[PDB]
Structures are given as C-alpha cells and as structure tokens.
Design a protein around this ligand. Structure first.
Ligand code: XVD
Ligand code: R16
Ligand code: C14
Ligand code: D12
Ligand code: D12
Ligand code: D10
Ligand code: D10
Ligand code: OCT
Ligand code: OCT
Lengths: 162, 51
C-alpha cells in the first residue's frame, strides 16, 4: 500500500512544483499588474497587453538569488532525483538501502523550497495592497506533499529492516 | 448696538474619533501574516527532519 503511495506522490509533487514556477501568476499588485517569478506581465498599464522581463539591476548576494531562482528550482531537481530512487524498488530489488537515499532527497527539497520563498518575500518588499495569486499557493503544496512523501519513504525503510 | 446677549469665537471643528473597536485577531499584529505562516511551515519542516 505505502510502496505505491510514494511513486504517485513524486509525480504529483514534481509535476505540480514545475507548474508553480512556470506560470507567472504569483503576486497581484497595483494599474493591476499580476507578478511572477522571472518576469511580470503588466495589465492596465496604458497598454492592452504588455509583458516585459523584470530588471534587478554585501546585499548583492540576495539580488542574484532572486533573479536566478535556483532554490524554487533545486526543489524540483531533488523531487525527480528522489522520484527515480523509489522507482528502483522493482529493478535491482532486495537492496533494502536505496529507499533511504530517497527519504533524504524528499526532505532536502523541502528545505530548499521554504528557502525559495524567504528569498522571494524579503526581496518583494525590498498603502500598496498586494495579494498572493492561485499560482503561488501551488508552491505551498510542493512542500506539504514533500513532507508526507518524506515520512512515507523512510517508514518503509524501517519496516524493511525490521 | 445693545449689550452682547451671547459671546462666541472662532472655534475648531475636527472629525470625532470613533471607538475604533479592535479586530478579533488584533493580537496577531506585532508579527506579519508572512511571519506566522513561515513559522508554521518551519515548524512542520523541523519536525519531519527531527523524525
Ligand atoms: O514554492 C513555495 N513553497 C511554499 C511554501 C509555503 C507557501 C505559503 C502558503 Cl502555502 C500559504 C501562506 C503563505 C505561504 O508562504 C509564506 F512564506 F509562508 F508566506 C508558499 C510556497 N511557495
Ligand atoms: C490564508 C487566510 C488568512 C486569513 C486572515 C484573516 C485575518 C482577519 C483579521 C481581521 C478579522 C476581523 C473579524
Ligand atoms: C544576470 C541574469 C542571469 C540569469 C541566469 C539564469 C540561469 C537559469 C538556469 C536554468 C537552468 C535550467 C536547467
Ligand atoms: C510561460 C509559457 C508557458 C505557459 C503555460 C501556461 C499553462 C497554464 C496551465 C494552467 C493549469 C491550471
Ligand atoms: C530566462 C530563461 C528562463 C528559463 C526557465 C526554464 C525553467 C526550467 C525548469 C526545469 C525544471 C526541471
Ligand atoms: C512543463 C514540462 C517541462 C517543461 C520544461 C522541459 C525542459 C526544458 C529545459 C530548458
Ligand atoms: C494571520 C493569519 C494566520 C495566523 C497563524 C497563527 C499561527 C500561530 C502558531 C504558529
Ligand atoms: C505514517 C503517517 C505519517 C503522517 C505524517 C504527516 C506529517 C504532516
Ligand atoms: C490560515 C492559517 C490557518 C492555520 C490553522 C492552524 C495551523 C496550525
């Protein structure tokens, strides 16, 4: 039962996190122009449809991380590396040690996912009422489902050893 | 003219401040909404790592 709830969760967390970083509908500011991750597409900006890329230019280390969004992407890279580790349960089975290697990547992506928001909120503010769009809440599901998949992958490793 | 039957003067008129009833969640003011959510997500993150 739990052996199948992990492979379906890896493809439901990686395929869901790659969408949150793709569509640029994270933040809604004010004309009302919806924001994004790498570029914002303006609306009601003296033009019908305009979408231009943002220009970000020892505090310079935070600007490059916000521009080169590696933390919200590194979590997706670890989700696919862990998604193929649990896929190694059929081929080259009876190892009882490759499942533990997936429980580390499933939680290491959650640490790099919460960080990708701290560098995004601190750089956002750095009156004007701004809200979070539906595309920003998708990234939140990429962290909750990253912990349920991190408790279900290690629990199997404990049962296999016991 | 007769004796003044009423005294007056140039006065100031400002908007009366209302009671300003605080919200139900007024105790969550010293920390922003982003801080409270980040604490919860860090709370579950530390717990899973500790397990
Ligand atoms: O890639 C992403 N990982 C995420 C993890 C959490 C949230 C989030 C949610 Cl789900 C609700 C309310 C505030 C939130 O972010 C906060 F920083 F706490 F303000 C967004 C995320 N996006
Ligand atoms: C995510 C959902 C956050 C809801 C926050 C509601 C805060 C309301 C404060 C004033 C309440 C007045 C009844
Ligand atoms: C000064 C602007 C620098 C932008 C760097 C963007 C790096 C994107 C890397 C994507 C890797 C995908 C695999
Ligand atoms: C950035 C260029 C590709 C944009 C793709 C948008 C896909 C939206 C899917 C919405 C699903 C709810
Ligand atoms: C400015 C160029 C932006 C290109 C963004 C590519 C995102 C690829 C994500 C792959 C995740 C596995
Ligand atoms: C949404 C499906 C994945 C889109 C990206 C594919 C790889 C692009 C590398 C530049
Ligand atoms: C401001 C709306 C969210 C409040 C969350 C309070 C969490 C308290 C325990 C961390
Ligand atoms: C064996 C079930 C573990 C559930 C953990 C949930 C963490 C949010
Ligand atoms: C909108 C935030 C709800 C928080 C409920 C309590 C979480 C521990």
């Amino acid at each position: 039962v739990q052996v199948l709830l992990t492979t379906i969760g890896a493809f439901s967390a990686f395929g869901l996190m790659t969408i949150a970083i793709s569509t640029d509908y994270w933040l809604y500011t004010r004309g009302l122009t919806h924001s994004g991750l790498w570029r914002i597409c303006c609306l009601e900006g003296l033009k019908r449809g305009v979408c231009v890329k943002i220009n970000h230019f020892a505090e310079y280390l935070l600007r490059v991380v916000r521009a080169s969004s590696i933390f919200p992407i590194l979590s997706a890279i670890l989700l696919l590396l862990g998604g193929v580790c649990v896929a190694a349960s059929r081929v080259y089975k009876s190892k009882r040690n490759i499942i533990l290697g997936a429980g580390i990547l499933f939680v290491a992506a959650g640490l790099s996912n919460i960080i990708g928001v701290i560098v995004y909120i601190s750089a956002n503010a750095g009156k004007n009422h701004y809200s979070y769009g539906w595309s920003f809440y998708f990234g939140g599901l990429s962290f909750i489902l990253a912990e349920v998949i991190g408790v279900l992958a290690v629990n199997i490793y404990i049962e296999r050893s016991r | 003219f007769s004796k003044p039957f009423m005294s007056l003067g140039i006065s100031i008129m400002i908007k009366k401040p209302q009671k300003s009833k605080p919200g139900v969640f007024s105790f969550l003011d010293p920390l922003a909404y982003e801080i409270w959510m980040c604490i919860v997500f860090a709370y579950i993150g530390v717990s899973v790592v500790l397990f």
